[PDB]
């Protein structure tokens, strides 16, 4: 058996697999070596996974995660995995997870629309080019946080529909003042903004929300996708925003003259296939 | 004599005055009760002002500052002033400073374009209406930080002119990676973004920079100014961004059918007049 894990801001997905056969899947909290020390990662692993995961003969562990983006950060995660499982562990970024999960050994443009957003050209083996996403303030166009940022900007200006404003304040138990406090003074403001992506998804019948999604999705295409040779290679998407707003994403694709026929919630299914070759 | 002080992110201006006559002016660091305790404010005062300020018979002290926006925050500043000067001290916000400095006892729309941005309707006595600015992430349209945010977004995407990108990296001794670090991990990211407003001002001959200013100034008008009865009252501006980019601001005014003939660097001259009545 092998273990394949994919970690983002909201959770880690663990797949215990034999070849392409799923023995078990388990979710734990997100694990990010920029926010968590080696020991916290080890502890979160140790407390989150069932016993069967730790008693099982594993040939390798493939881990992909947000924040696994340098040699040093990959080491922290690797040390935890190696300590917890006593087996070869290979740590890569969430971006390479998207590329390999979406493309296998073919070439094309892989894009993530999740808490943040990301894109790359993948040559079937390595990432060859990677437009900088820029994070929740300076970029991450088309991401959950970008949506949340524009929505909350509109809430404070009273520009959004009253129904949405009232529902937002009630659901989150907030006032305008408390919004400022959360965004400017409390941990992980990006995650709170990105949570708005889930909130807004119930209100898609409103012109306001459709226009907000179209605007942010177009921005991702103009500022990220179209830096690549996007008319000459397949463009494939993964992530919670891409998945939940797949119809609007497809519409934006057609506006830019492309056919987006691959939109997946996560790269996990593709990663299981990839590590079976 | 009285003492009139106006405090923002970059500095405090102190005016020792008899009626409308300026005895002396001194600059110290900014003083903001959200970032500095009463004792730090007192110390910064005590170390920043000349002896003559402390030996002088003063009838009152009028202080206006960023962050002096609640009863409690005003108290902190007041306690410091009262301890340092042993005289009646009246603490108000930087917004009321703009209103009173720009309008005296007349009515109209007062706007600030500085590190952040702000606007209000002033009835000649009190602020009657105040669109929420929203801060550097969710709003502050037309501010230095909004400029810096779009510029740096463009820098990371490689969309800005190469000359600007090279000059930015060299002047600030930064790389793309170090930019992320400053914005996401270091204190007062708003102040660093707002500093870009001064950097860009030397490059106004570039189409890119003109278009950036026009876009951000238009945004301030669409999302803030035009929430007020802006065709029926004078609109007056104060602040470093408004002052440095006065020609483009005036142009944006005309686009929205208004004549902006009052643009001041600071409200200080107006405040001296106001507190002489």
Author numbering:
A (entry chain A), B (entry chain A): 2 to 278
List passages from the publication reporting this PDB structure.
Unlike other bacteria, the pathogenic Tannerella forsythia, a member of the red complex group of bacteria associated with the late stages of periodontitis, lacks biosynthetic pathways for MurNAc production and therefore obtains MurNAc from the environment. Sugar kinases play a crucial role in the MurNAc recycling process, activating the sugar molecules by phosphorylation. MurK and K1058 are two sugar kinases of the cell wall recycling system of T. forsythia, sharing a sequence identity of 44% and separated by a single PGN-scavenging operon within the genome. Structural and sequence data showed that MurK and K1058 both belong to the group of ribonuclease H-like kinases and are members of the ASKHA (acetate and sugar kinase/hsc70/actin) superfamily.
We were able to obtain structures of the apo enzyme (K1058apo) and K1058 in complex with MurNAc (K1058/MurNAc). K1058 crystallized in a tetragonal space group (termed K1058apo) with a single protomer in the ASU. The biological corresponding dimer interface as is observed for MurKapo results from the application of the crystallographic two-fold axis. A superposition showed a close relationship between K1058 and MurK, with an observed Cα-RMSD value of 2.1 Å over the total protein length. Initial attempts of soaking MurNAc into MurKapo or K1058apo crystals with or without an ATP analog failed, probably due to an induced fit accompanying MurNAc binding.
